[PDB]
Structure 1
Amino acid sequence: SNALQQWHHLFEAEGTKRSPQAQQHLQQLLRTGLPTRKHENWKYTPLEGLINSQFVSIAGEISPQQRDALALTLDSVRLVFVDGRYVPALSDATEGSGYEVSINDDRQGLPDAIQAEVFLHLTESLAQSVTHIAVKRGQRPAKPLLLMHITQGVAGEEVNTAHYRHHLDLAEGAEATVIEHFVSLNDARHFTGARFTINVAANAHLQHIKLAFENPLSHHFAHNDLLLAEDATAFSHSFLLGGAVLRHNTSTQLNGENSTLRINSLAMPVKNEVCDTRTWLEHNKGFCNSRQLHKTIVSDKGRAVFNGLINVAQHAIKTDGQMTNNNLLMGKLAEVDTKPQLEIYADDVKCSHGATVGRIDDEQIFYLRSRGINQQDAQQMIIYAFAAELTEALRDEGLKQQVLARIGQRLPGG
């Protein structure tokens, strides 16, 4: 493969002091190695492009003008990261924002991974620093925390790679909204990886939004963790639009009773792209309700891959959980591979999933065209309607509109 050794050399690279945690992760990364297409969980997601490449870690630098050119228009507390590196000059003062933020490589308090896989390990080892985010007890910050990631490629066939690591602690009774934004500086391809671990304490409310907006040629491999205590609420919305190959994991544990969890994602592969969206949920305590809505819209030889698993622990009674995956295939060469999965160790529970694969209604299209609306505009009205349930959960209208634009760029228009 050669890829593991390159990543290893990046690990041991010049003048970099690495935490014990990162080394521990590196070694299990090296122990399990890279998966093949005959692995249970790798059948539909191609590694061929990524594992034969020459990798470099090159931290470049950018101007404020470039940043704001790529930035969301939002009123927020915005931390800016470039090529795996925190950039104070481009960031906002966090004091008095409600967010206690510290960027450094001390990992001593970081929680263990819920489900361990090769790329989680890679990101853990190659992450240059950790963002420690804490919201104190009972606090409900006025502005959302925005974490903007600007990653760039390098000239040549070299793939510049960057790995980001964040941890957010919502203290008991805290309520906060946090957004991940991922963009490319330019059209040069790059390899991104990201891990965001979030701890939600008793009576804490989390809203997490992930926007992976990077360029058509790059690789985005991410694994997020949500830990919920009792009486806790967590919502996570991921809109994965960008990258040549994107694989996102959200692993959640419900470790306390009477907690609410909702996890959504939107995938929209165009042009040879592969979009892999995966979830791992464990109900380890009873009386928790969970809901999942995962929608894919596949165009143009694109491949959407859905994987999700609800594990109901023994004795976790009065569990209520549901998973829905709706897939729309508009390309004749388009493909969707979906595997909703239940593992249920308790009898007194309600757990269900459903998954659909469907087409564009030709009759609707024709009806719209017959009144003068162009075929493409029509198809866009219908598609937008199909994703509307997901985009409508964004409460900020200004943000929602930008997301809808990003969606629009991948439609048969613009």
Structure 2
Amino acid sequence: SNALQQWHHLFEAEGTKRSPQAQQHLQQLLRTGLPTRKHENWKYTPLEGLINSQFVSIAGEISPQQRDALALTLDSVRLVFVDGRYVPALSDATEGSGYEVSINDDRQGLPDAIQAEVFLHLTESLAQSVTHIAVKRGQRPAKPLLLMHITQGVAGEEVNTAHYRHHLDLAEGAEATVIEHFVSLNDARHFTGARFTINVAANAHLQHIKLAFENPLSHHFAHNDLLLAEDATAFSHSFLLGGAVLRHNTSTQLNGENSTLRINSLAMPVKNEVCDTRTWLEHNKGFCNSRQLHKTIVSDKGRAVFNGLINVAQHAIKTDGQMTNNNLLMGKLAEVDTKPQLEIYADDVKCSHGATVGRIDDEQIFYLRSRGINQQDAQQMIIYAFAAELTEALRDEGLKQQVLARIGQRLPGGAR
């Protein structure tokens, strides 16, 4: 099997009116080829379970009952996507919601990639449609927009693959919360690709949340972009809790002065899984403040990978950027690779990065247990304390409890 050939085949599949944009990304995809473990950005992320596999794109259909059984409990404006396809019958109406929504394959407006890379090109080229979302000037929707993704694998050794593409434009003064939720229909492995680009205009405020909760055997490769103008505010929270191999990228450009940015993420790989969380940040204008908190909890035979690039352009005075990566290792076979990368070309700044690696504080666990709390609960209380700063940033208790439930379920002293 030749992955590039397979994907090329899916691109040419009979009955596919692919856009010029998609065609350009296909060429880039075939131009760059697949990286090896010798490539600067791929020393720790395995592609073996992908490079030599047969790929198919089977768009099935599910019932509201199946959707509900996997859906989050939340009052939102929910758009449902199944195996790479928007499913109207399973989605909520958007009229009067505060969100202008159109789903089609017209891509004339989409911005160029901040950081071009092989899997971003793959998704752009195989996405069957683009979700055009916009929030008009000064509008602050009452409910969060929820993009629910349901992907399924097929019987056999073939790997069903679906690629999702969404773009959000937050006009001046607009303030919205958008959530991307990914789940697997069943235990069959699948290859999920996703790309959510977002443009944040002046005085606009974004609350972005990503919940990748797919099964243990799937591959999840995504690349989101955040473009901020001046006086813009953007918060992005990612909880990568699923998949055999997951690689998420968030590339950002602060193209306006006086903006505030926060990008957080939690990686929780369990037995044999690899969770790769990466960010790319450009402080192109001065007077912006950026904060990043990426935490990982690795269980026996799991591997967390962090990569955080921060470039501060010359003239970007008064830049205030921080990045923190705290890693907690659960067993003697767990692994973690972290690579912060700072490129600072302005002196009048305050930039810093910090990363820690260690195991859960056993003295605290024993203390809790000596008062009567069982091992499982003591451990959960401490992990929750560890992730508290990330989960509380959700600013939504109801949602927070479901994310915590997902976290607690992946702990050794819980289910394993």
Q: Normalising to structure 2: TM-score of the pair?
A: 0.99
Per-residue CA distance 1:359-407 (angstroms, 9 max, x = gap): 1222112222222222222222111111111111111111100010011
Q: Would the aligned equivalents of 1:318 and 1:348 in 2 still touch at CA under 8 Å? A: yes
Deviations 1:246-281 (A, max 9, x none): 000000000000000000000011111100000000
The CA distance in 2 between the partners of 1:232 and 1:151, in whole Å, is 34
- The whole-number CA distance in structure 2 between the counterparts of 1:361 and 1:198 is 39
Asked if the contact 2:299–2:412 (Cα under 8 Å) also holds between the matched residues in 1, the reply is: no
Q: Could you say which residue in structure 2 is the equivalent of 1:90?
A: 90
Residues in 2 aligned to 1:336 and 1:153: alpha-carbon distance in whole angstroms: 29
Secondary structure of the residue that 1:9 maps to in structure 2? helix
CA–CA distance in structure 1, aligned partners of residues 308 and 39 of structure 2: 16
Cα deviation, 1:333-363, whole Å, max 9, x if unaligned, reads 1000001110011111111010111112221
Residue in structure 1 matched with residue 307 of structure 2 by the alignment: 307
Counterpart Cα distance in 2 of 1:312 and 1:135: 30
Structure 1 residue 331: deviation in Å? 1.1
- The CA deviation string for residues 19-58 of structure 1, in whole angstroms up to 9 with x for no partner, is 0000000001000100000000000000011112111000
Is the 1:380–1:412 contact (alpha carbons within 8 Å) kept by the matching residues of 2?
A: no
Q: What's the CA shift string for 1:71-114, capped at 9, x where partnerless?
A: 00000000000000000000011011000000000000000000
Give the match's secondary structure for 2:287.
Answer: coil
Between 1:404-413 and 1:185-194, the stretch displaced more is 404-413
Secondary structure at 2:234 match in 1? strand
Q: Deviations over 1:158-205 (max 9, x none)?
A: 100000000000001100000000000000000000000000000000
Which residue in the other structure is 1:360 paired with?
A: 360
Give the Cα–Cα distance (whole angstroms) in 1 for the partners of residues 152 and 176 of structure 2: 30
Measured after TM superposition, the shift of residue 318 of structure 1 is 0.4
Query: Residue deviations 1:104-130, cap 9 Å, x none?
Result: 000000000000000000000000000
Q: CA deviation at 1:152?
A: 0.3
1:243 is aligned to 2:243? yes
Q: CA deviation at 1:11?
A: 0.2
Which residue of 2 is the match for residue 50 of structure 1? 50
What RMSD over aligned residues (CA atoms) do the two structures have, in Å?
A: 0.8
| Stretch of structure 1 that moved more, 34-43 or 380-389 | 380-389
Q: Percent identity?
A: 100
Q: Give, in whole Å, the separation in 2 of the partners of 1:269 and 1:17.
A: 38
Distance 1:288 1:182 in 2: 32
Q: Output the CA distance in 1 between the equivalents of 2:6 and 2:44.
A: 25
Deviation per residue, 1:294-348 (Å, 9 max, x gap)? 0001111100000001100111100000000000011101000001110011111
Q: 1:295 & 1:197 partners in 2: Cα distance?
A: 23
Asked if the contact 1:278–1:308 (Cα under 8 Å) also holds between the matched residues in 2, the reply is yes
CA distance in 1, matches of 2:406, 2:158: 28
Looking at structure 1, the residues matched to 67 and 367 of structure 2 have their Cα atoms a distance apart, in angstroms, of 44
- CA distance in 2 between counterparts of 1:392 and 1:178 reads 17
Instruction: State the alpha-carbon separation in 2 of the partners of residues 195 and 281 from structure 1.
Output: 17
Distance in 1, Cα, partners of 2:256 & 2:29: 31
- The 3-state SS of whatever aligns with 1:238 is strand
Structure 2 unaligned spans of 5+: none
CA distance in 2, matches of 1:324, 1:285: 22
- Cα pair 2:322 2:353 within 8 Å, conserved: yes
SS in 2 for 1:320: strand
Check the 8 A contact 2:375/2:413 in 1, yes or no: no
SS at match of 2:328: strand
**2:220 and 2:246 in contact (8 A); partners too:** yes
> Is contact 2:175–2:204 with CA below 8 Å preserved after alignment?
yes
SS of the residue 1:62 aligns to: coil
Cα pair 1:264 1:294 within 8 Å, conserved: yes
Question: Which secondary structure does the structure 2 equivalent of 1:391 belong to?
Answer: helix
**1 CA distance for matches of 2:58 and 2:392?**
38
Tell me the distance in 2 between the aligned counterparts of 1:378 and 1:268: 19
Q: 3-state DSSP class of the match of 2:258?
A: coil
For residues 253 and 156 of structure 1, what CA distance do their matches in structure 2 show?
A: 42
Task: Give yes or no for contact 1:249–1:279 (8 Å, CA) kept in 2.
Answer: yes
Cα distance in 2 for residues equivalent to 1:135 and 1:372: 51
- Measured in 1, the distance between the counterparts of 2:56 and 2:173 equals 43
Aligned to 1:210: 210
2:379·2:413 contact (CA, 8 Å) conserved in 1?
A: no
When structure 1 is superposed on structure 2, of 335-344 and 372-381 the one drifting more is 372-381
**3-state SS of the aligned residue for 2:405?**
helix
Distance 1:306 1:382 in 2: 22
Q: Paired residue for 1:334?
A: 334
Q: Does the 8 Å contact 2:130/2:167 carry over to 1?
A: yes
Following superposition, the deviation at residue 131 of structure 1 comes to 0.2
Distance of 1:326 and 1:126 partners within structure 2: 35
Deviations 1:197-225 (A, max 9, x none): 00000000000000000001000000000
Task: State the shift of 1:412 in Å.
Answer: 2.5
What secondary structure, in the 3-state scheme, does the structure 2 residue paired with 1:392 have? helix
Which secondary structure does the structure 2 equivalent of 1:393 belong to? helix
Alpha carbons 1:216, 1:242 under 8 Å: kept: yes
- Say if 1:225 and 1:251, in contact at 8 Å, map to a contact too: yes
CA distance in 1, matches of 2:264, 2:347: 27
Structure 2 partner of 1:4? 4
The offset of 1:413, in angstroms, is 4.5
In structure 1, what is the Cα distance between the partners aligned to 2:373 and 2:355? 31
Paired position in structure 2 for 1:182:
182
Q: CA deviation at 1:144?
A: 0.4
- Asked whether the equivalents of residues 77 and 143 of structure 1 are also in contact (C-alpha less than 8 Å), the reply is yes
1:131-171, Cα deviation, whole Å (9 max, x unpaired): 00000000001100000000000000110000000000000
- In the other structure, the counterpart of 2:29 is 29
